[PDB]
Amino acid sequence: QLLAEAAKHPDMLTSVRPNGLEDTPQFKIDIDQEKAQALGVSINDINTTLGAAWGGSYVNDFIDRGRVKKVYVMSEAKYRMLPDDIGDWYVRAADGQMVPFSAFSSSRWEYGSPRLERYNGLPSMEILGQAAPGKSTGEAMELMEQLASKLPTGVGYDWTGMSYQERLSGNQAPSLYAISLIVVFLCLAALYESWSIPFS
Amino acid sequence: MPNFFIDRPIFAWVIAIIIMLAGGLAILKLPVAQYPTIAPPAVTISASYPGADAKTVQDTVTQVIEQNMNGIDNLMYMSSNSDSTGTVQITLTFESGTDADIAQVQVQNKLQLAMPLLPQEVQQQGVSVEKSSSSFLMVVGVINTDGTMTQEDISDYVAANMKDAISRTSGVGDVQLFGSQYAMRIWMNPNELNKFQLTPVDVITAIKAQNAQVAAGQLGGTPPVKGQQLNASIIAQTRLTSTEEFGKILLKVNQDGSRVLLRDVAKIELGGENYDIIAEFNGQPASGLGIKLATGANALDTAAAIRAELAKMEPFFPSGLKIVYPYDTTPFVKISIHEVVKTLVEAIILVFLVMYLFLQNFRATLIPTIAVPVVLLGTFAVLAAFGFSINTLTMFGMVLAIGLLVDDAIVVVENVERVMAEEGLPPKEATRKSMGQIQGALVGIAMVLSAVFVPMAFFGGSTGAIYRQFSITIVSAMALSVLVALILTPALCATMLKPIAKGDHGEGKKGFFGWFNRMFEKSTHHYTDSVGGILRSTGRYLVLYLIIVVGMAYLFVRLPSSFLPDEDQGVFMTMVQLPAGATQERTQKVLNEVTHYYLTKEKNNVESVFAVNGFGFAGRGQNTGIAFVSLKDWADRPGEENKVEAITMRATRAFSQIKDAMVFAFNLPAIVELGTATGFDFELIDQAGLGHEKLTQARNQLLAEAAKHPDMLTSVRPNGLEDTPQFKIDIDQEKAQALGVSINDINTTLGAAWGGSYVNDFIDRGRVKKVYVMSEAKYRMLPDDIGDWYVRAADGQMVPFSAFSSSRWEYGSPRLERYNGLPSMEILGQAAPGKSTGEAMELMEQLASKLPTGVGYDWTGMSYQERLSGNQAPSLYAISLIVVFLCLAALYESWSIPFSVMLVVPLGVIGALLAATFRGLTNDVYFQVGLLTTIGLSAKNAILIVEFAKDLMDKEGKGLIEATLDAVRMRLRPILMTSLAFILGVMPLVISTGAGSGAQNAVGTGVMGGMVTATVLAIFFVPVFFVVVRRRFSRKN
Amino acid sequence: GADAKTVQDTVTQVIEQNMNGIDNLMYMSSNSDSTGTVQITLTFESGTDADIAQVQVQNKLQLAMPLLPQEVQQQGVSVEKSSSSFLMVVGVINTDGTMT
Amino acid sequence: QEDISDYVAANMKDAISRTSGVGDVQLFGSQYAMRIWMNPNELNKFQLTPVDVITAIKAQNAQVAAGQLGGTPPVKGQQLNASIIAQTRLTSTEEFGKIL
């Protein structure tokens, strides 16, 4: 609704875009965990197989030109590309026989947002955007503040990063002229010896 | 050059008005709290090893940590404990003055010297290292009114929704829960594990494995094969998210699918990290926050927004959840932020009364009403560059300083009003004709005020942080009350005035004041007939004065050197203490009575009772318990009988009737370790390696020996716990393995049935919450239920514990404390009421000589404050005595000349010592500021009287006998306009009680009826102090 | 190699839940993703010492570490004062193609 | 030496390192650590490895979170609380002697 509200002002808000990525498909593998135990396999033979072949796993260090580098086990690339490559991974049962992942693990697909961006313990979705060529941020950020206060209470708008320091400039930089010049409005009476010369 | 601001006068007018908003920007920048950082910076390391007694968690956790603590900076006393709920709490009381943030991390990352040497359950549970003592801002009781939510049902709602959201709010530094949240309390039914031939190993080994998020891989990952167009992310076994999904955590299945779900061996439900705390709030169960200040203390904006951010949560409350505040810092100061401003406005009028007293004008009298509100907010502004805060030690420090900013206001307009009132010259020159002879004396109008802060940096510690809060307060009340009185106020004697007749005594004054202005003439001749008759009696009034000060030390030795008074802080803590090894059912049953006692017999005083079963500030457990008690505002209850000490002493009487519990109560300061007001707190040590029972016989011999001297060592009690029984199991190793078991199967059974073992975490509602396997209640509740636990042999035949685990009872102290790397015990103590603590500290040492080898003795709390300094009054107020001798000798330009202004020090302390008789308060720090407020102004009159005698020796050339007879007679008309110039400012300080009365009614009559010795009784002797100097040291012979 | 729905739950929600009253804070934003990377960004008040900050972040993280499921630090975590300005961002390339 | 180095360690070092003024105390010996001297012609007698000597000492000499009789939560209707002593970390050469 925000890009229904803020991207539809294309003159001023140029390229208002999100940061938090769209919900990619994620590949749920239902380890049908009783088959994954009735077949004879311990599941730690499975989660280590499923998660240090597809996964990539630190093992230990090694020495290389006298330098410590890591040791990574992983599947070779052409054996972890597809849901077909589920079926090629073999796990060992109790009695030493080998069982495939396609014998028990019933795969499927689901949503999932990779960039789960949080905020102090609150999930969030960051949104970027520039201002118009020839115009400024303050006539674009307050334009966003016309379009961020549209939403009801429940999902709030925050202004920070570069956006905090201009939200701080909007609270003290024209207000800098008050306490600066009033001291100057009181410097003159010391110099000119009258209340009325600071009127001039 | 003082008139460099006068030679164009509005060059002096505006600079004070510059302070009115260039300080006014910083008085809104300045944050509020009731109390500054009094406490020395402590570091509380809270380890937790659940289900293990003292001697375990002394050995597995505490001794490992205390071995590392060698190479850290600036500790006072590294106090500890180790109790039976498995908690360590070592407290590194550091040096005062040095910071916390550098000093916390120096002991927080060399706790990482031996984090692996701690067992991998306590470093799987918690070592939380805070930089805070017990200064809470407020406690927020969350309370279920209906009964649907239990106690622990509250606590995750506080954790998952409030703790983070309350710690969002500014000013909030630390947030605890008395919860904490829904750990998945895996129970175990040991007559169901034996059904399936399992142990608590395989329940753990499943849940550590079948409940574990896996590094699941990515389809189309890195690198791709050349020719890949699909990229997803795998979800492997998620951390399971339900009580029902742990239900189908698998166990042994056979090869034909005869499964064992874990819900057949476990009454799976959500629970707590520990049930060691059963809170209660008016009979119904509560959780609770505990909120602390952010360093950079904020209490105006914090608690106003802590409430305000809490106002977005009553739409989100479940059925009958209420929020109530059993404690709060701020309503102590939510009313004094307005009234101490409102007392000041009438104090302005009390100084405008002084302008209304003799002048009785309406345009020449606006000078103090504009001289005052410049100084009060500039007083904030300079300490806002010091960074210190408005507080009940500093707003009280400036409700005194509005007597100490007006006492220079209406003496230098009235010296100008004096000089214009015998020769009638206009104030345009009288602002110079007064200053032409005393220009080396308005560097003197704050010069004993320059001499009463130079050791106020020179107090260290807890009480040393108090004098600093009055130090820079009386330096800003020195500086910008004199830089508006040497510069502004002489220029303020030029414009708004109504100049007078030819030497106005007050000829044409018509009123009943004006006839009483001829009783202003009653003390014209009589105060001259005083000093003229004091000069005739100059030999018997010389020798009278050294024996009106014999009652000084005679009152001061019987004025007991106590500490800060017990304020009615609106709460009082009620401690229960059951017998040794009394269960949590009994304590709640006693806290049923004590809650029913504080409610149904004191409805009028007690707002409520937030009662925690199991918490002990003395030490947690099951036989202890605390009742946080909420009191009310004094607009709801009257009188001394409804103050704290009257409430608590009525309580402890009826607590003799409650059997099975040694119930009492007490009051709270900010710190809870200030002693017993003749306070010594004592850490008797073990040195040799005698164990604890040989150290215990030392306790049995010296707590008895403390009871053998009731004359000196009155209270004989330790803070710790009596040696409770604790239940040894002879896991019979040699028997056990021969029986066919392994030993690691035993201890993971025994240590996760009877203990409660953390396993891993699960995910409730997108929040990470613990998983504790534990035995059910009815199966770990007796020594008989040892035999119901079944442990798997080599082959898989089940083996009961009672086949191989004989058992026996024995002692054990379920809270062992430690001296710094050696065992110790917290011996409390009081000197007998109205005695010194230095002999009570020393007698304990030569009664610890009655105790055997390997026993040291050390101190903690305010006792290590006593260990560094007994009393810094006699020799470090000599540098408020000698430093007065050097400064005012510069004025008179003579050695032994300030020996006249040294004889108003007794005439200022006797007024302070008499207010301890006509009300009956003790020697506290606010009595020690009661000296410097009153000898701070006994000296300034003793400048104003006898520095005009320097005009009568270095401008006028009268003889010093009759120059003093002119220092009563020329000085005469300002005499009633100097002593009464201040003492009209102390007026609201009698009938104002409630919330710490004795700082402003006893010290109030230490400054109303205490300044009478310094204003209407010192000045009889002040002029003849000049001649009793200048009749022995006469340079006129 | 891990996911993102439960990289915030293994790693991030633990390090997020020690953040009791952050010393002169303005916001703490974190972002777990599909590569198993977490970047908890604690940004503080200006004028507050960045030197004490990286100290105090690992006195907020290392206030209350072993509320960590301890693999949180066993994988390798790196507190860093990421003033995300750089100096030169020197690239090192191969010209012929022998080195990958 | 080592008969002395613990007496420095168990008594002096924790008393000098909080003697006034003293910062870092660096002990120059050791604490009196139980030195299991294995004997490989006794291992070959009993057919063991140092693995089984380590696995036993990491088991029988292991302090256990033993729990409480009367622990929290109680059953409704309870009157007894105690703590349990499981296997204490064994305090002697003579008690490591009967490490099984």
Next chain:
Amino acid sequence: GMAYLFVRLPSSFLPDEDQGVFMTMVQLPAGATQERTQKVLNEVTHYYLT
């Protein structure tokens, strides 16, 4: 002229400095590979070098 040409004067914070670099970011469909994103940065590099 002051009061009308100040609130109508656009209120930015900092100008765009010609810093000699500019970052061009690419954003593929949800679930597009490192091969395909490289295949677009074939074009974008070929764009910025023709």
Next chain:
Amino acid sequence: ATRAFSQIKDAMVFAFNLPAIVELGTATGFDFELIDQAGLGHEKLTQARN
């Protein structure tokens, strides 16, 4: 000391004195590394030092 320590065989016995900072020696004594960059190991670094 050192002269009679020439008599002690089996050991290059010598002695010295402690300055305020003890890493210099005979009042000007410099100190110096010889680092390896190219992954040569230590013996080829030692052959550099030999």
Next chain:
Amino acid sequence: DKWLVTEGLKAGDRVVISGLQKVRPGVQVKAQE
């Protein structure tokens, strides 16, 4: 919630239950039941 005893006590004896702080051996007892 009751100990069973085989020796040490006889029938009809008056077991103290409530108040083991304030009762040292040899005090008057307001022995209610």
Next chain:
Amino acid sequence: MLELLKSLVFAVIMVPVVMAIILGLIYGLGEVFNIFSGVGKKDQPG
């Protein structure tokens, strides 16, 4: 604002009463300040 109703009537009665007790002090005891009469000076250093 009612304590400015106090300090209308109790800053006009508690200001003269403290002014009246000092009259009981400095004039009542001021008479006995002049009943005491004698010379006892030790002028020995001079």
